Amino acid sequence: SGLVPRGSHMEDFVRQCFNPMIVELAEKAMKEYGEDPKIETNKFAATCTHLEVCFMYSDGGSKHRFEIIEGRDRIMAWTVVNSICNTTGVEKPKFLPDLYDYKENRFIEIGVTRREVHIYYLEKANKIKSEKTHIHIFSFTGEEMATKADYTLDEESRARIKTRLFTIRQEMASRSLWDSFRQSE
Ligand SMILES: COc1cc(CCNC(=O)c2nc(-c3ccccc3F)[nH]c(=O)c2O)ccn1
Ligand SMILES: [Mn+2]
Ligand SMILES: [Mn+2]
Secondary structure (H helix, E strand, O other): OOOOOOOHHHHHHHHHHOOOOHHHHHHHHHHHHHOOOOOOOHHHHHHHHHHHHHHHHHHHOOOOOEOOOOOOOOOHHHHHHHHHHHOOOOOOOOOOOOOEOOOOOEEEEEEEEOOOEEEEEHHHHHHHOOOOOOEEEEOOOOOOEEEHHOOOOOOOHHHHHHHHHHHHHHHHOOOHHHHHOOOOO
16 A cells, blocks of 8 residues: 555546446556556546546447447457457548447447647547548547548437536536646647
């Protein structure tokens, strides 16, 4: 119990802000990549936020529309990706995406930003390069930006995500945690 703390204000906020299972998946995703949520608390909240947005995103639309890639361990996620590619014929993406759209026949990369959605997508579009994987960026301010202006979901489903994102921002600010969270990206 030396360099590893017993608790943090951000960690306690993450646990009361997000559903317990979302917190567990974020802990597993971080520990799989050698990161401890008890110290890097800003990344802990961001992974939780990205997880919840991904699950809300898949909750929009029909029952069998989306195959959820995020939230699984790396090996299982790449296994499902291989099955989707070897079933639909879609090219294997270089980087692990977040979802697959059975309706649109494309993988989706979900992004949640604390800057303008313009820089983030411009980053993610240049990282994945492949103009076949769909990109959908959400901001804590309420904007969004998707590939070919195709926002996939209904307006109501996307507005729910933007509303939740702004609520997380307000809850952090009332705890004086937002500025360090914003400056961490
Ligand atoms: C540093 O890299 C990782 C990766 C993992 C597991 C897989 N995570 C992603 O693939 C994935 N990650 C992120 C994100 C990463 C760090 C901070 C805030 C984020 F929002 N955004 C995505 O959009 C996104 O898809 C856990 C911790 N750190
Ligand atoms: Mn991901
Ligand atoms: Mn993502």
